[PDB]
Amino acid sequence: MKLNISYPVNGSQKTFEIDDEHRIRVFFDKRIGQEVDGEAVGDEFKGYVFKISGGNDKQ
């Protein structure tokens, strides 16, 4: 899938393509509002914590 993300602090926003089903099962079965740690999904995101705001599915 893809991940559009924003950093309010800088106020920036960027998109990132991702594979690795077993990086994203981290996210699977979660709400829009919960928080997860990022090295689970990419060590580039180590120490970081994301939150979700929603998304846009297939179709």
Binding site: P8, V9, G11, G33
Partner: protein, 126 residues
């Protein structure tokens, strides 16, 4: 092989176990077993039946998953580049709050300019 849930009872249904029922509204249901299926033919309520997951839910037994959505405590502390601010100049203006005497001096100079303008007005009228 995929694992499913009982359209009545809420159980994992391992392969070739249980049954399926279909309904001319195209709808599908799965059953682990003849028990749930028979309740279904009896057009029953899996929320008034006890031993279902649905009932353990709608009566809140073993609900140990969801805890709390926390409300944080934090400030802005992100002085943004306001697009006409020049963040160095922004801090300069933020620190120049005192010394309203310069404001007072500009205001008195404007009092003088306005007096001169009204005088010129009365003169041009006369």
């Amino acid at each position: 092989m995929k694992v499913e849930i009982d359209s009545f009872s809420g159980a994992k249904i391992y392969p070739g176990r249980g049954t399926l029922f279909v309904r001319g509204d195209s709808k599908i249901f799965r059953f682990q077993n003849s028990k749930s299926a028979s309740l279904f033919k009896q057009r029953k309520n899996p929320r008034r039946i006890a031993w279902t997951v649905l009932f353990r839910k709608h009566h809140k037994k073993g609900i140990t998953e969801e805890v709390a959505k926390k409300r944080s405590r934090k400030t802005v502390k992100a002085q943004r580049p306001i697009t006409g601010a020049s963040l160095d100049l922004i801090k300069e203006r933020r620190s120049l709050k005192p010394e309203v005497r310069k404001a007072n001096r500009e205001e008195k100079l404007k009092a003088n300019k306005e007096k001169k303008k009204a005088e010129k007005a009365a003169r041009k009228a006369e």
